[PDB]
Design a protein around this ligand. Structure first.
Ligand SMILES: *[C@@H]1O[C@H](CO)[C@@H](O[C@@H]2O[C@H](CO)[C@@H](O)[C@H](O)[C@H]2NC(C)=O)[C@H](O)[C@H]1NC(C)=O
Ligand SMILES: *[C@@H]1O[C@H](CO)[C@@H](O[C@@H]2O[C@H](CO)[C@@H](O)[C@H](O)[C@H]2NC(C)=O)[C@H](O)[C@H]1NC(C)=O
Ligand SMILES: *[C@@H]1O[C@H](CO)[C@@H](O[C@@H]2O[C@H](CO)[C@@H](O)[C@H](O)[C@H]2NC(C)=O)[C@H](O)[C@H]1NC(C)=O
Ligand SMILES: *[C@@H]1O[C@H](CO)[C@@H](O[C@@H]2O[C@H](CO)[C@@H](O)[C@H](O)[C@H]2NC(C)=O)[C@H](O)[C@H]1NC(C)=O
Ligand SMILES: *[C@@H]1O[C@H](CO)[C@@H](O)[C@H](O)[C@H]1NC(C)=O
Ligand SMILES: *[C@@H]1O[C@H](CO)[C@@H](O)[C@H](O)[C@H]1NC(C)=O
Ligand SMILES: *[C@@H]1O[C@H](CO)[C@@H](O)[C@H](O)[C@H]1NC(C)=O
Lengths: 73, 312, 223
């Protein structure tokens, strides 16, 4: 309904507690997206990861993929 | 410097205040106000793109292990400090402490300072726990002394040099880190580069505001005085002169902002390149990642900028 | 396997380009900006700027020169200001495009004509090569890169102690599968027996921290 953000007052967007990637940038870490209504949430910087580090452990790849990407200029 | 303050100026309210007669006279010039608003909006979006390209280069958010023992290397001055209610490293806190209407608005940045701090923490954790692997695929764990042996091998020094002087090198590293924190605290001109951007933008806005008190040939610089002292047939002339002067001032501000935004974006692209090469890998480019043979780099968030600690 | 992966990547790239209309948004943004600037410049011709009419022919055919001079001067001032604004914006955008073209030329020289060690300059991963492709008012690079995968978990040692001497890996790294020790290259798991031709000797087993006991095979003892 009504949601107060550091970038002002947002009307018509239901604040949603889960975090996703940014779709429409509102500001101050707040992003809005359409799911069916418009929701406003806090952007997520990425999936959590904690690589197991110890002083005598190394991870070595065993096989590989050839990946091709496009860059437009 | 990475980004500057995102500012937006209402052309109609700046030129004409809240006067409908002035708005009707302003419509005679076409779509100047639309062009100015469009240019300022483009600059504002470009600032968010700058910060995204500099810091948002990793997908996952890596974390350092709770037990922090890396063969004698001591990263307490660059890792986030949970004791403070900011999750900033001590150097980041020092950096954030060293830096100091009329239709004018300041749009908040898309990425909060806490989010940039989390991106920096993820980069530091990835570099510490996996070397340069996490920047080119899956994060492969490796003991930090072994990673520094690889980096020593990358500059023409055999790895047995590192191990046989391991506790020596760690000491030097720690001492160097400490000295950085001292110098920044003892030198008020260390962060001049960011302060130049802040001062330039603030001074431009101050001059733009101060241009509202100029007669420009009219009988007064206050629009309400002209309206309350004259009737439309000859008040239109005075309002026209004020409109011309204020419109030219706003045009000058917009052009200056476009040029300065181009400069800032060039610096942001340089910072993104240094984040990709100096931080996510080891660079053989001379003087690109500091004086000497580059070993590694540590990014640090700064208000409207990025600070690289080049270990060489 | 590598040839099959390369062909699959090329096919996937073509399919992604065909199925996504927003992939080429950069060139479209440039074209839209130029067209919109031209449209604004042309639309500025229909503004009075304070004159009685926005058409010079009407003023010429309605008023004598002595009084039509003021209207023509106002129109001239307005149109000159609009044209100057357009030219300044075009200069700034041309500088932007020149910077982008310099970056594209650098990428063509370093990613296509050779192999680049710069991280993320020629695509994500370890750069293998690049292929140029023409685009309307632009260039598209196909960065072929090597991405390691299916990593696995190992116990490593900085050096191997044998006969009171410390042996360091000449090119790879020492690994352990649980009971035995091998030496393998850092970017691919190809274990090999620790011999005297893939390790070098430096010092004794007292300085290095974390050294482990293992036997170093000698290719001369059998004979
Ligand atoms: C490396 O990964 C590739 C996939 O990129 C594996 O290729 C697959 O192998 C399985 C097992 O025989 C087949 O069923 C699939 O059809 C193969 N895929 C392709 C695209 O050829 C390859 O086996 C992997 N190598 C190792 C040693 O695990
Ligand atoms: C890593 O370095 C920091 C540098 O501050 C050490 O932390 C200090 O340790 C001393 C005692 O040696 C304390 O008096 C200070 O209060 C500590 N400062 C902070 C900010 O905690 C830390 O001990 C070092 N870690 C190791 C394992 O040596
Ligand atoms: C670690 O590697 C060694 C060396 O390859 C493995 O020992 C082999 O084990 C197989 C299967 O049991 C035997 O057929 C070979 O003769 C062994 N080779 C030698 C040289 O002894 C060992 O099994 C591996 N360990 C693990 C846990 O995978
Ligand atoms: C690795 O092997 C060496 C010998 O090759 C071991 O060193 C011995 O350690 C014992 C126990 O402290 C001493 O009594 C011997 O005199 C040492 N021998 C030599 C030749 O120095 C060493 O302890 C072994 N390492 C491990 C982890 O077991
Ligand atoms: C989010 O979680 C908080 C707890 O901090 C709770 O009070 C709030 O109702 C939640 N919001 C939604 C939309 O679930
Ligand atoms: C290596 O071991 C750790 C132990 O905590 C485990 O979490 C990690 O997933 C292992 N890595 C792989 C690739 O299996
Ligand atoms: C790793 O840490 C353990 C304690 O967890 C210690 O006993 C061992 O000596 C360390 N190994 C190296 C190579 O530093």
């Amino acid at each position: 309904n009504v949601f107060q953000t550091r970038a002002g007052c947002l009307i018509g967007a239901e604040h949603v507690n889960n975090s996703y990637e940014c779709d429409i940038p509102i500001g101050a870490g707040i992003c809005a997206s359409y799911q069916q209504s418009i929701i406003a949430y806090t952007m997520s910087l990425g999936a959590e990861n904690s690589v197991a580090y110890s002083n005598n452990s190394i991870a070595i790849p065993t096989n590989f993929t050839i990946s091709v990407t496009t860059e437009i200029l | 410097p990475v980004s500057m303050t995102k500012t937006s100026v209402d052309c109609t309210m700046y030129i004409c205040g809240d006067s409908t007669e002035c708005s009707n006279l302003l419509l005679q010039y076409g779509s100047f106000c639309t062009q100015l608003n469009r240019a300022l909006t483009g600059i504002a979006v470009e600032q968010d793109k700058n910060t995204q390209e500099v810091f948002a280069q990793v997908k996952q958010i890596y974390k350092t292990p709770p037990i922090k023992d890396f063969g004698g290397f001591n990263f307490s001055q660059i890792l986030p400090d949970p004791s403070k209610p900011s999750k900033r490293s001590p150097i980041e806190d020092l950096l954030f402490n060293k830096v100091t209407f009329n239709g004018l608005t300041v749009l908040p940045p898309l990425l909060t300072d806490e989010m940039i701090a989390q991106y920096t923490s993820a980069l530091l954790a990835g570099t510490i726990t996996s070397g340069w692997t996490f920047g080119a695929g899956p994060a492969l764990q490796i003991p930090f002394p072994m990673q520094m042996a690889y980096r020593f091998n990358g500059i023409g020094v055999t790895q047995n040099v590192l191990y046989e002087n391991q506790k020596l090198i760690a000491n030097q590293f720690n001492s160097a880190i400490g000295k950085i924190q001292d110098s920044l605290s003892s030198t008020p001109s260390a962060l001049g580069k960011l302060q130049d951007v802040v001062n330039q933008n603030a001074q431009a806005l101050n001059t733009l505001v101060k241009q509202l008190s100029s007669n420009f040939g009219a009988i007064s610089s206050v629009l309400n005085d002209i309206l309350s002292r004259l009737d439309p047939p000859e008040a239109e002339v005075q309002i026209d002169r004020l409109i011309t002067g204020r419109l030219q001032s706003l045009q000058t501000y917009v052009t200056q902002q476009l040029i300065r935004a181009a400069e800032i974006r060039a610096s942001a692209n340089l910072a993104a390149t240094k984040m990709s090469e100096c931080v996510l890998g080891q660079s053989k480019r001379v003087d690109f990642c500091g004086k000497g043979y580059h070993l590694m780099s540590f990014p640090q968030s700064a208000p409207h900028g990025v600070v690289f600690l080049h270990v060489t | 396997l590598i040839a099959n992966q390369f062909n699959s990547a090329i096919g996937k790239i073509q399919d992604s380009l065909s199925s996504t209309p927003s992939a080429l948004g950069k060139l479209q943004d440039v074209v839209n900006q130029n067209a919109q600037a031209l449209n604004t410049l042309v639309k500025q011709l229909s503004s009075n700027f304070g004159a009685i009419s926005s058409v010079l022919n009407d003023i010429l055919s309605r008023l004598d020169p002595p009084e039509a001079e003021v209207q023509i001067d106002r129109l001239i001032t307005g149109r000159l200001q609009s044209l100057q604004t357009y030219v300044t914006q075009q200069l700034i955008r041309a500088a932007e495009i020149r910077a982008s073209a310099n970056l594209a030329a650098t990428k063509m020289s370093e990613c296509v004509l050779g192999q680049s060690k710069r991280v993320d300059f020629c695509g994500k991963g370890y750069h293998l090569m690049s292929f140029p492709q023409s685009a309307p008012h632009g260039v598209v690079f196909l960065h072929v890169t090597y991405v390691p995968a299916q990593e696995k978990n190992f116990t490593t040692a900085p050096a191997i102690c044998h006969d009171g001497k410390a042996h360091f890996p000449r090119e790879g790294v020492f690994v352990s599968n649980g009971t035995h020790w091998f030496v393998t290259q850092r970017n691919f798991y190809e274990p090999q027996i620790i011999t005297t031709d893939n390790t070098f000797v430096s010092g004794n087993c007292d300085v290095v921290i974390g050294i482990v006991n293992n036997t170093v095979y000698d290719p001369l003892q059998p004979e």
